[PDB]
Design a protein around this ligand. Structure first.
Ligand SMILES: CC(C)(O/N=C(/C(=O)NCB(O)O)c1csc(N)n1)C(=O)O
Length: 268
């Protein structure tokens, strides 16, 4: 790694953004030194499902002082299901444990699981309050699934910046936001993600294991956040937010993977 390479990488990100009609928000952090590669680091983007990492962390933090919270089973009916409930739709009735709901929302992006957990914590503002408690003054959760993914720009609801989210992801997965057992559990879940094969994972070498959470929304919004763990050097934090100008736009997995690849190559 070198300063020269990082500056060149930021230029490559500018060039990558020029290839599509949208915005690229990007922060990668090499935790060996805190070196950063960024683009639009301080602009707000809709986080979409990437908030499920902050949500699950809040649940884990509560569980640290709330005996057997993770084992509590929350019942729900078929009429309670939100659009896109690939795991929870199989357990209607008695429901699933809090731990199982965290796993479902992180690994499959299950929306009913997310809403059940948001409600358990006392509403969206409890997730925001948790973010504040780990030093994130930027993150805000205002709505539930699936409304938080939608456009009804100037709307700041359900947004964060790439820089704020990178710091929070670093603190949660590598640093000192959670207790050691809780940090290990969050990593364990996110390393098992099933929805990110075409995003950050597609931009890093085959030996780097990636704990990530994706997000997708209106205006072709395509996001992925997480940490890559090389076997032989310090973890690297990746935050990629993309959103398009056209409401009809598709998300761009290829752009997300290319952005990650730019930083992975520059750092190592
Ligand atoms: C598939 C993919 C990308 O998308 N997930 C959703 C969904 O609502 N995601 C909210 B979030 O991932 O931003 C979804 C709604 S209908 C459907 N199929 N998927 C995901 O699970 O990650």
């Amino acid at each position: 790694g070198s300063h020269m390479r990082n500056v060149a990488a930021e230029q490559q990100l500018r060039e990558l953004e020029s290839t599509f009609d949208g915005r690229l928000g990007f922060v990668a952090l090499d935790t060996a030194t805190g070196a950063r590669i960024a683009h639009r680091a301080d602009e707000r983007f809709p986080f979409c499902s990437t908030f499920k990492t902050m949500l699950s962390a809040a649940v884990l933090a509560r569980s640290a002082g709330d005996a057997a919270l993770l084992q509590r089973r929350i019942p729900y009916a078929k009429r309670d299901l939100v659009r896109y409930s690939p795991i929870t739709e199989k357990h209607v009735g008695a429901g699933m444990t809090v731990a199982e709901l965290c796993a479902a929302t992180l690994q499959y992006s299950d929306n009913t699981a997310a809403n059940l957990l948001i409600a358990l914590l006392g509403g969206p503002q409890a997730v925001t309050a948790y973010a504040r408690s780990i030093g994130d003054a930027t993150f805000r959760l205002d709505r539930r699934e699936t409304e938080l993914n939608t456009a009804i720009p100037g709307d700041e609801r359900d947004t964060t910046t790439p820089a704020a989210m990178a710091a929070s992801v670093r603190r949660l997965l590598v640093g000192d936001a959670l207790g050691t057992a809780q940090r290990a559990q969050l990593n364990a879940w996110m390393l098992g993600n099933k929805t990110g094969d075409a995003r950050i994972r597609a931009g890093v070498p085959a030996g780097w294991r990636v704990a990530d959470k994706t997000g997708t929304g209106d205006y072709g919004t395509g996001n992925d956040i997480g940490v890559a763990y090389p076997p032989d050097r310090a973890p690297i934090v990746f935050v990629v937010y993309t959103t398009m100008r056209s409401r009809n736009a598709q998300a761009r997995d290829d752009v997300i993977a290319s952005a990650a690849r730019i930083a992975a190559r520059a750092f190592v």
